[PDB]
Design a binder for this molecule. Structure first.
Ligand SMILES: *[C@@H]1O[C@H](CO)[C@@H](O)[C@H](O)[C@H]1NC(C)=O
Ligand SMILES: *[C@@H]1O[C@H](CO)[C@@H](O)[C@H](O)[C@H]1NC(C)=O
Ligand SMILES: *[C@@H]1O[C@H](CO)[C@@H](O)[C@H](O)[C@H]1NC(C)=O
Ligand SMILES: *[C@@H]1O[C@H](CO)[C@@H](O)[C@H](O)[C@H]1NC(C)=O
Ligand SMILES: *[C@@H]1O[C@H](CO)[C@@H](O)[C@H](O)[C@H]1NC(C)=O
Ligand SMILES: *[C@@H]1O[C@H](CO)[C@@H](O)[C@H](O)[C@H]1NC(C)=O
Ligand SMILES: *[C@@H]1O[C@H](CO)[C@@H](O)[C@H](O)[C@H]1NC(C)=O
Ligand SMILES: *[C@H]1O[C@H](CO)[C@@H](O)[C@H](O)[C@H]1NC(C)=O
Ligand SMILES: *[C@H]1O[C@H](CO)[C@@H](O)[C@H](O)[C@H]1NC(C)=O
Ligand SMILES: *[C@H]1O[C@H](CO)[C@@H](O)[C@H](O)[C@H]1NC(C)=O
Ligand SMILES: *[C@H]1O[C@H](CO)[C@@H](O)[C@H](O)[C@H]1NC(C)=O
Ligand SMILES: *[C@H]1O[C@H](CO)[C@@H](O)[C@H](O)[C@H]1NC(C)=O
Ligand SMILES: *[C@H]1O[C@H](CO)[C@@H](O)[C@H](O)[C@H]1NC(C)=O
Ligand SMILES: [Ca+2]
Ligand SMILES: [Ca+2]
Ligand SMILES: [Ca+2]
Ligand SMILES: [Ca+2]
Ligand SMILES: [Ca+2]
Ligand SMILES: [Ca+2]
Length: 220
């Protein structure tokens, strides 16, 4: 036998759908037909993409009908891109016994969306506030942000961490007011501090959590 033949794809252009993030996962498989002798290196396919955008793709070969098995190199992420036009050429392991036509496969990808958790913006060393505060007064009018611009999903603001009960939140407007009697003078307060953490949840359409710390400067 001789490497008289080159490999030929059975589709020339494919398509597949994909998800943003669990991932490193099988997108689509490809078909081809070289005509020289089967168990031979004049029959084993070798691939490669022409251009690897963020270099987030890997493709292996398989001794089945030595189909082209493409996958995800490093998860995706997005709301950044939906389209992927890339091309893969196929060779044999051993060079050709004649000039031949190299034949590519052109392929299109689409990224499905998964919706992620929201986040308070910072982790706040905010309110240098005094001990004389009136039980029920504006301390920190805060806000959190959520990724997915599909944004027709709101959330609810919940508090959480805790030495004892002073502060209070409007859950549908994230407003931290100050209820209670405080006293810079004494117990939990360690260095001039009082640190508290709170939460926020992604609803509207699925699930979410947001852990944000909050240090507030008490006064004398
Ligand atoms: C698109 O992708 C699907 C994946 O199931 C594939 O069957 C199809 O041949 C590809 N091409 C087009 C035009 O749909
Ligand atoms: C490989 O695919 C081409 C495209 O149809 C076809 O003509 C050829 O017969 C296939 N190879 C074999 C051994 O059938
Ligand atoms: C498929 O092709 C790639 C690209 O060269 C190669 O690295 C990989 O080893 C091949 N897979 C097999 C099983 O030969
Ligand atoms: C694949 O990318 C090409 C290049 O623009 C486009 O024509 C095609 O619609 C994309 N997806 C499918 C289903 O072929
Ligand atoms: C304040 O933050 C510190 C540092 O993590 C933590 O140990 C403490 O429990 C928080 N609350 C108070 C009242 O100090
Ligand atoms: C949000 O995260 C919290 C972490 O404190 C977790 O316990 C909770 O299950 C999450 N909520 C939802 C709705 O998934
Ligand atoms: C946020 O909530 C998650 C869910 O329990 C938790 O794992 C994480 O420690 C929390 N803290 C931050 C800063 O996200
Ligand atoms: C892609 O995944 C395969 C399977 O683990 C690995 O052997 C290979 O090094 C990775 N990268 C490339 C370019 O094939
Ligand atoms: C097409 O490119 C391949 C390498 O990817 C090369 O081996 C082949 O000879 C090229 N085609 C021609 C007609 O030279
Ligand atoms: C695959 O199809 C696309 C669109 O028709 C084209 O740009 C690309 O060059 C094709 N590859 C081959 C080998 O024809
Ligand atoms: C693969 O085929 C396409 C279209 O036929 C061609 O434009 C491209 O140059 C080829 N790629 C290689 C490496 O030969
Ligand atoms: C809360 O968020 C702050 C960021 O300001 C971080 O330093 C701290 O470790 C977090 N505490 C917890 C329990 O998540
Ligand atoms: C209070 O202030 C000092 C100086 O900024 C800081 O380094 C320290 O972490 C804070 N709390 C304690 C218990 O020292
Ligand atoms: Ca061949
Ligand atoms: Ca032959
Ligand atoms: Ca995303
Ligand atoms: Ca998303
Ligand atoms: Ca979300
Ligand atoms: Ca006091």
């Amino acid at each position: 036998d001789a490497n008289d033949n080159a490999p030929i794809f059975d589709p020339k252009t494919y398509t597949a759908l994909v998800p943003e993030n669990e991932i490193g996962f099988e997108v689509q498989r490809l078909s081809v037909t070289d005509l020289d002798m089967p168990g031979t290196p004049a029959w084993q396919a070798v691939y490669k993409i022409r251009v690897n955008e963020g270099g987030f793709f890997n493709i292996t070969t398989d001794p089945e009908s030595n189909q082209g098995i493409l996958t995800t190199a490093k998860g995706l992420d997005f709301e950044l891109r939906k389209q992927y036009v890339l091309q893969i050429t196929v060779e044999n392991a051993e060079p050709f016994s004649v000039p031949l036509p190299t034949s590519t496969a052109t392929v299109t990808v689409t990224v499905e969306d998964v919706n992620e958790a929201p986040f308070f913006v910072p982790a706040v060393s905010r309110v240098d506030v005094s001990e004389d505060l009136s039980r029920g007064e504006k301390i920190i009018s805060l806000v959190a942000q959520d990724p997915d611009k599909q944004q027709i999903q709101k959330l609810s603001y919940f508090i959480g961490n805790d030495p004892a009960r002073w502060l209070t939140v409007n859950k549908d407007n994230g407003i931290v007011t100050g209820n209670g009697n405080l006293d810079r003078e004494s117990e939990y307060v360690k260095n001039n501090t009082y640190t508290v953490i709170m939460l926020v949840t992604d609803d509207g359409v699925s699930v979410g959590t947001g852990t944000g710390t909050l240090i507030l400067h008490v006064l004398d």
